[PDB]
Structure formats: structure tokens, C-alpha cells
């Protein structure tokens, strides 16, 4: 009594009001922007969906007793919304269900009444006009049954409900809604379904069936137009291609669909991370590092989002092969716990010439390296150490006898030194030249001058940028 009766008053008040008014305002705005301003892409619909994704999902995992959030289904289960009294009475029913739940015990679902709270919800003269509301209130029950964090008696229901919602949205878009483009929401739905499939493929077989379904799903897109649809499906599919079945790489290399220019910024980071991974695994290193750094600064601004850790654990190896990382710059407070234990010991061994310590660290942390799915290091990093030494020699000296590098890089012979330096110059790490006569290695000509035709080539790019920005800005000014 002291823990259940006394803690009952505090809980009931907040979910009774704040969540209900939240979904009320969101539905009102959705109805307003679907009725007027058919170009309703720019609205609070996306902000509402993001807030529901961020805030409402985490506030609860259990079935929300005392009819606070489980009661919404028995509220909207009978909705007509044909004329003014029908919509008014459906809102009144919502209010009355909230009042009853705050006064007495309202309708409860015992892990099996959600289908009647879902079948009857689409029954009782339900309104198609709020198709987005149907989708939202059908997907929200997924996350509770998904984020129940139990994975018992809810994953199967999750899969069935997901299939129901997918079928509903496919039949809805079969009519090709006019001046509405519900896809702006559908995408999230799609992602959500993939979620449970992963959960399904975490509780059962992988997402190959999902793979076929989503090939069909992007095929039904890309035809009319694209509105944030394909931009999600592509990275979902190449996520599954690389999801513990990553051994498949050959194909996606021929995924030649253009990636849409105007996309949600958060997704561009996923796209560039996966492009970097695929580029680096097949041994191209010039483009990989630059595009991955472009990815990192694209959308990192958050309090420890989490995958920045992984991109760092990749950019360190992918640029270890070519030079030096900021040795102490990036080991700060978030990543410090992980990155430091293996990667720091590595780069420290790499700058030094200690092969035995390299083997020691490899033996110690190979399990962690394989767990991260980045075991390329032994494959190439162990046998490409001498490249760094050649780079250093390039930076310091400008005229040296190749008979000296052998004692400087412990090669013990001049001829194989000639071979390795020639290979390095052909690879383009250094542009020196060799006198094949008397053990003479010379640098290229001095830097000619920094103001002949190489500068203005950059200022042209910057003008293109600046004038483009000004035009983009001036166009979309004051719609009404």
C-alpha cells in the first residue's frame, strides 16, 4: 500500500494530460496541413513525428496501467468523424476515456485485446480522412510492444501488426493519394518495420524476406517521384547486405541509383559511412578517408550519439596506412574508454619500430578487433609499415644516398631498398627521382610558385558556392 497506493497519485496526472494534449495538437496540425496547403511537407508534422520518436517512446516500457496510455485505444476505438457532431463526439470520447481513467479503471488490454483494440479501432465507421492518424496510432502501439524490452509474446505480435500496417499503407498508396503524399510519414513506418524484422532476425532468421519486400518497396517508389522514400530504403538495404552477411560486397558496388540531393541531413551520415566502409574494404584509400571525414562532421552535434565512436575506430585504421593520426588530439571524454585500449597501443607501436609489441597487442585484442568487424589491420597494416618510414625520409632529406636508408630503415640491403622506393614513387606517396648510377635519390624540383593558375582554380569553386547560396536563400522567402 505505501508503495503502490502512494505512488499512484503522482503518475496518473502527467500521462492523463500531457500525452493526450500532445497527440491532440499533432493530429489537429496534421488535419490542418492535409486539408489546406497541400504542399504540407514543410510543417510541424515532421517535428511531431520526431518528438514522438524521441520523447514519447522512452517515457514507458510496461503496459501503462491505470489506463493512461493503454486507454487511448479504447478512446478512439469508436470514431465516426463524418460531420461536426461525429468528430466532436469522438474528441469527447477521448476526453471521457481520460476522465474515466482518472476516476475509475478504464478498459485494459491483457496482451490479447490489442487486436480488438486494433480491429475495432479500424471498425466503427472509422475515418479515412485521418489516414495519418491511423498510421500514427497504429505504429505507436508497435513501439510499446517493440520497446517492451521483453522479447516474449510481443515479437510475433509485432511482426503481425507490422504486416497489417504495411498492407494498410500499400492499399492506401494503391489509390495514389492526391496532393497529400503520405510517404512523408510512411518512410518512418518502413524504418519501424525494419526494426522489428531485425528484432525478428535477432529472435529468428535474418531479414532476407525483408530484403525482397524492400526491393519491392523502393521499386514502387522512384517511379512517380521520390519524397524521402528511397533515401531511406537504400541505406536500409545496404545495411542488411552488410549485417553479419557483410561478406556479400560484390553486388552493392553496382547499386548505381543516384542518391537524392535534398535529403534529411541525419541520413547523409549513414550513407557516407557505408560508402566509406565499402570503398576502404576493396583497397581504395584516397577517397575513403576524405569522404569519411566529411561524414563525421556532417551531423555529429549531440551528446554522445554513439556511432561517432565507430567512425573513429575506422578512420584511425584507414588513415594509419597512409601517414599519422592526431596522436593525442582525439582521445577525449566520450571515446576514451574504448579507442584508448587497443587503437592507441596500436598507433603507438606503429610509429615506433617494435614489431614484437605489435604482435603482442594483436594477440591481446584480436577478439575485440574481430568483434568490431574491422580485422583488415593484420591483413595489410602489419606489412605496410615501411611506407611511413619512406614518407618521413621524404619530408626531411632532399638528397640522400640510398645506401643510407638501409641503415636508417633496417633493410640490410640497398637493392631491395631501390625496389621499395621505386614502388613507393609509382604508387604516388612520394614524387622523388632516382639517379640509377651512384646511389642518388633526389627530391622533385622546388615548389615553383604558389600563384600561377593553381590559386584561381579554387576561387572559382568558392564563387559557385556563394552565388548558389544567395540564390537558394532569396528564392524561398515569405510564402504568403
Amino acid at each position: 500500500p505505501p508503495g503502490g497506493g502512494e505512488q499512484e497519485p503522482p503518475p496518473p496526472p502527467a500521462p492523463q494530460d500531457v500525452e493526450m494534449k500532445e497527440e491532440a495538437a499533432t493530429g489537429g496540425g496534421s488535419t490542418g496541413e492535409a486539408d489546406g496547403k497541400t504542399a504540407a511537407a514543410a510543417a510541424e508534422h515532421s517535428q511531431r513525428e520526431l518528438d514522438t520518436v524521441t520523447l514519447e517512446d522512452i517515457k514507458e516500457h510496461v503496459k501503462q496501467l491505470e489506463k493512461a496510455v493503454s486507454g487511448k485505444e479504447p478512446r478512439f476505438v469508436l470514431r465516426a468523424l463524418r460531420m461536426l457532431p461525429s468528430t466532436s463526439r469522438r474528441l469527447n470520447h477521448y476526453v471521457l476515456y481520460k476522465a474515466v481513467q482518472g476516476f475509475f479503471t478504464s478498459n485494459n488490454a491483457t496482451r490479447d485485446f490489442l487486436l480488438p483494440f486494433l480491429e475495432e479501432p479500424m471498425d466503427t465507421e472509422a475515418d479515412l480522412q485521418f489516414r495519418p492518424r491511423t498510421g500514427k496510432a497504429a505504429s505507436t502501439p508497435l513501439l510499446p510492444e517493440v520497446e517492451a524490452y521483453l522479447q516474449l509474446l510481443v515479437v510475433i505480435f509485432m511482426m503481425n501488426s507490422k504486416r497489417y500496417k504495411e498492407a494498410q499503407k500499400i492499399s492506401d498508396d494503391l489509390m495514389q493519394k492526391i496532393s497529400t503524399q503520405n510517404r512523408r510519414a510512411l518512410d518512418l513506418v518502413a524504418a519501424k518495420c525494419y526494426y522489428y524484422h531485425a528484432r525478428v532476425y535477432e529472435f529468428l532468421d535474418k531479414l532476407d524476406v525483408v530484403r525482397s519486400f524492400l526491393h519491392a518497396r523502393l521499386r514502387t517508389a522512384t517511379l512517380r517521384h521520390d519524397a524521402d522514400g528511397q533515401a531511406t530504403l537504400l541505406n536500409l538495404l545496404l545495411r542488411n547486405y552488410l549485417h553479419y552477411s557483410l561478406y556479400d560486397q560484390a553486388e552493392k558496388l553496382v547499386s548505381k541509383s543516384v542518391f537524392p540531393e535534398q535529403a534529411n541531413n541525419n541520413e547523409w551520415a549513414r550513407y557516407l559511412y557505408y560508402t566509406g566502409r565499402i570503398k576502404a574494404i576493396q583497397l581504395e584509400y584516397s577517397e575513403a578517408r576524405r569522404t569519411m571525414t566529411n561524414a563525421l562532421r556532417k551531423a555529429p552535434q549531440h551528446t554522445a550519439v554513439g556511432f561517432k565512436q565507430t567512425v573513429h575506430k575506422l578512420l584511425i585504421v584507414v588513415e594509419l596506412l597512409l601517414g599519422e593520426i592526431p596522436d593525442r588530439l582525439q582521445f577525449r571524454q566520450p571515446s576514451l574508454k574504448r579507442s584508448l585500449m587497443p587503437y592507441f597501443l596500436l598507433t603507438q607501436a606503429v610509429r615506433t619500430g617494435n614489431l614484437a609489441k605489435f604482435n603482442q597487442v594483436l594477440d591481446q585484442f584480436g577478439e575485440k578487433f574481430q568483434a568490431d568487424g574491422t580485422y583488415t589491420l593484420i591483413i595489410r597494416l602489419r606489412h605496410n609499415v615501411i611506407k611511413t618510414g619512406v614518407r618521413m625520409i621524404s619530408l626531411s632529406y632532399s638528397r640522400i644516398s640510398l645506401a643510407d636508408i638501409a641503415q636508417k630503415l633496417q633493410l640490410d640491403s640497398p637493392e631491395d631498398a631501390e625496389f621499395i622506393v621505386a614502388k613507393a614513387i609509382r604508387d604516388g606517396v612520394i614524387e622523388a627521382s632516382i639517379n640509377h648510377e651512384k646511389g642518388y635519390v633526389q627530391s622533385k624540383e622546388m615548389i615553383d610558385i604558389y600563384s600561377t593558375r593553381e590559386p584561381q582554380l579554387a576561387f572559382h569553386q568558392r564563387i559557385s558556392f556563394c552565388l548558389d547560396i544567395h540564390n537558394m536563400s532569396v528564392k524561398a522567402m515569405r510564402f504568403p
Partner: protein, 378 residues
């Protein structure tokens, strides 16, 4: 002083890292411990140091006698005198808290000061209490404590009473010197040399001058170094008594490099034995060596390393290896040769320098306007 002696802190450091040096310092460290009956700290140190000697009984009984005498005095005062604020009870518990700081651990003393700070209304007493907190925090290098109370003093109080504040323009810098960061700050605020409390303000004058010289030679080399330190008769007075330091300065200024390295070896050796400076000895030696190398490399454009082999020290291969190490790291702005031993210096023309600066400052700003425009507009 409020703290019994920062000297004792220096001593404990001088005895901690070297076990071999557990002979000379302890000889008077034990005397300083037994005197004043500041017993509470040394027990653990004695667990770390030499084993034990039976004196805890008498030290405990005398500390307890003083404790109870002071407590009875203060309670009788609070029962007979009924004034608050800056009244007699306040100073009685000042005596108690000061005795705790002098003798015991920091927790009880700091709690006493916490319970007495709200009692005051006079700003001078608040400044005195924050000074007590600064001294006790700097005694054990409790970083967050001093970071909080320095801001407390410098913001909440420093708008009324003045000139009793120059006692603090030398403590900001004690902190900025114990941590490697910002030698520039300490150099530019140890600029004043009218020090006040000779030993109540921690270290003695002469040590203060050696510290200002030591830091200053880094933050500014020959951008009017002379008009600040060479023309400073006030420090020329005291360094006239110390030959080593004046030899060091005038060896670097007059371009006499061999004696300069001798002196720097001496300075590095003695800086090893310190408390505030010991962590950064090895950032000093390296950032001085490189300054001298670039100072001589200027005024030449094609030098022969056989010339530095003598005009700067000895050991052709030695300067070879050092030049290699420093050039690779992006410093000692030049290039090298090996077949005929001719170090050639390259230096960007002004125009190239300005072009290189703009090419990055601009695109950095462009990236920020890019992100701004992307967040706005949906």
C-alpha cells in the same frame, strides 16, 4: 600563515619520488611534524615513509587538551554572549577552524569554513575566508576546489574593496604554472614585481624572480623581451646576486650557444626537483632547444652543418638526428641535405603566407554558413 608551511609540501614531494633521498629531507621534516602538533596528516605518510615511533600518545593528548579548552571557551562565549555576525563567537570558531587547518585534515576545516561563511556580512572577512580556501586547496592541488573559489572571489566580491586583491594576481599564476597549459598567462601576469607578503605569500622573493624569468623566456623570445626583462632594474637587483640565472639569460641573448647549453642542462637538472614544476620539465627543455635552433637558423640561407658542429656544441651526427626529428614534426622551417652536408632554409614569401591563411579561414566559415542554411529552411 594560515597553512602551516607550503615548504613541508615541497619536502614531502622531494622525499616521495626518490626513495634514495629518504635521508636528508626527513631530518627536518620530522621536526616540522612534531612541532605545532599538526599530527593528523603525517600518520599516513609515515605508513608510506619510515615505519613508526611511539609519540602518538602525547601528541594526541595535547591536541585533545587544546581542542577541549577551545571548545569550552567557545560554548561559554555563545552561552554568555548573544551577538551574531562578526561577534565574538565568530572569532572563537575562527580560532577552532584555523587550528583544524593548521593541524588536522581538510574536511572538518572546510566544513567549519562553510558553516561560518554564511554568518558574515563584512566583505573583508569573506575575502579572508576565500583566501584560506585557496591556500588549503593549493596545498593538495585540489583542482575543482580552487577553480570554484577563485571564480567566487573574482566575481562575487571583487567589486568593492580594492588593492587587497594584488595578493591574488600571483595565485592565479601559481595555478597556471603548476599545470603545463598557458605559460603565456603566467609570464604576462608575473609581470609585476612588487610582491607583498614575503613568505606569508608562499614562496620567497628570489624564488619568485627565478620563476618569472624561467617562464618569460618561453612566452616571448625577442619580441621586445629586452624592454620587459633586460631593462628591468628591479629584477636586475636580485639576479645580480644569483650568477647562474643572469648567465643563462645573457647567454641566450648574446648568441653564445655552447655556454647556453651548459646552462640549460643545469636548469633542467634543478627543475627536476620541485613540486609545481616537476611535471613539465620535459616540455621545457624541448621547447627551448627548438627555439635556439630556429634562432640561429634565421640569418642564413645555406648553412654547412660542419659549422654548427662547433659553433653550437659538438657531434655532427647528433645535430643531424635532432634536426631530423624536429623537421619531421613540422617545425624548424627548412630542408636538409646529406651527401655534401648543406642545410638549406626555405621560407614562404609573405604573399604565400597570407594566401595560405585565407584559404582555410574562409572555407571554415563557409562550412558554418552551410550548416546554418541546412538547419533552417526545414
Amino acid at each position: 600563515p594560515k597553512n602551516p608551511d607550503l615548504r613541508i609540501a615541497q619536502l614531502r614531494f622531494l622525499l616521495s619520488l626518490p626513495e634514495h633521498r629518504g635521508d636528508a629531507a626527513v631530518r627536518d621534516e620530522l621536526m616540522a611534524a612534531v612541532r605545532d602538533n599538526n599530527m593528523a596528516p603525517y600518520y599516513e605518510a609515515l605508513c608510506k615513509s619510515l615505519d613508526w615511533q611511539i609519540d602518538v600518545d602525547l601528541l594526541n593528548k595535547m591536541k585533545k587538551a587544546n581542542e577541549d579548552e577551545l571548545k569550552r571557551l567557545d560554548e561559554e562565549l555563545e552561552d554568555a554572549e548573544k551577538n551574531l555576525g562578526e561577534s565574538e563567537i565568530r572569532d572563537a570558531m575562527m580560532a577552532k577552524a584555523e587550528y583544524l587547518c593548521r593541524i588536522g585534515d581538510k574536511e572538518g576545516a572546510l566544513t567549519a569554513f562553510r558553516k561560518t561563511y554564511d554568518k558574515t556580512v563584512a566583505l573583508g572577512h569573506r575575502l579572508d575566508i576565500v583566501f584560506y580556501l585557496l591556500r588549503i586547496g593549493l596545498f593538495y592541488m585540489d583542482n575543482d576546489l580552487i577553480t570554484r573559489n577563485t571564480e567566487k572571489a573574482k566575481s562575487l566580491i571583487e567589486e568593492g574593496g580594492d588593492w587587497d586583491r594584488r595578493n591574488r594576481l600571483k595565485v592565479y599564476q601559481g595555478l597556471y604554472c603548476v599545470a603545463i597549459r598557458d605559460f603565456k598567462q603566467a609570464a604576462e601576469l608575473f609581470l609585476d614585481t612588487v610582491s607583498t607578503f614575503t613568505s606569508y605569500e608562499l614562496m620567497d622573493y628570489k624564488t619568485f624572480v627565478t620563476y618569472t624569468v624561467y617562464v618569460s623566456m618561453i612566452a616571448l623570445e625577442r619580441p621586445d623581451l629586452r624592454e620587459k626583462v633586460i631593462k628591468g632594474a628591479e629584477i636586475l637587483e636580485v639576479l645580480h646576486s644569483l650568477p647562474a640565472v643572469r648567465q643563462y639569460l645573457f647567454s641566450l641573448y648574446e648568441c653564445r650557444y655552447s655556454v647556453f647549453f651548459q646552462s640549460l642542462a643545469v636548469v633542467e637538472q634543478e627543475m627536476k626537483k620541485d613540486w609545481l614544476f616537476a611535471p613539465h620539465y620535459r616540455y621545457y627543455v624541448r621547447e627551448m632547444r627548438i627555439h635556439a635552433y630556429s634562432q640561429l637558423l634565421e640569418s642564413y640561407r645555406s648553412l654547412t652543418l660542419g659549422y654548427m658542429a662547433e659553433a653550437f656544441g659538438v657531434g655532427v651526427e647528433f645535430i643531424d638526428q635532432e634536426l631530423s626529428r624536429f623537421i619531421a614534426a613540422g617545425r624548424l622551417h627548412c630542408k636538409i641535405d646529406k651527401v655534401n652536408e648543406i642545410v638549406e632554409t626555405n621560407r614562404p614569401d609573405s604573399k604565400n603566407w597570407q594566401y595560405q591563411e585565407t584559404i582555410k579561414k574562409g572555407d571554415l566559415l563557409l562550412n558554418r554558413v552551410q550548416k546554418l542554411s541546412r538547419v533552417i529552411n526545414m
